[PDB]
Amino acid sequence: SLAADTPTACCFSYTSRQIPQNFIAAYFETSSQCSKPGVIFLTKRSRQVCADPSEEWVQKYVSDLELSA
Amino acid sequence: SLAADTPTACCFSYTSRQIPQNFIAAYFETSSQCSKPGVIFLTKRSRQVCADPSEEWVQKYVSDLELSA
Numbered sequence A, B: 001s002l003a004a005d006t007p008t009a010c011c012f013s014y015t016s017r018q019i020p021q022n023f024i025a026a027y028f029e030t031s032s033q034c035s036k037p038g039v040i041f042l043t044k045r046s047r048q049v050c051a052d053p054s055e056e057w058v059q060k061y062v063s064d065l066e067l068s069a
Helices: A056-061 B056-061
Strands: A026-028 A040-042 B026-028 B040-042
Touching: none
Parallel strands: none
Antiparallel strands: A026 A040, B026 B040
């Protein structure tokens, strides 16, 4: 567990058209070392699309883990 | 091309034991919006390991694109 991996994922730019729960599947609330507002997603094309802060569609998807974990 | 993707990969912590060109294959010099020194790698386990700034072993691997691109 002490051997973490992966870089610091942070939403520096999201998309205009959202990604509803039809193609989405995973998600992420950015990461520390870069207090980012938007969140990263995981559509079916393994192509994260980022997302505004508290996006109507995200709050529903990220609803699972909304910051608290 | 205007529709970029992926978050801002930045090396916030690298490993002690390096990853020579035996398991390594890809690499990255971090990203902007987070001036990072170390570089991210792509061993065979798709597990980036980051790397000190100008690591003896990296300069050789990252040698291909060393900042200039």
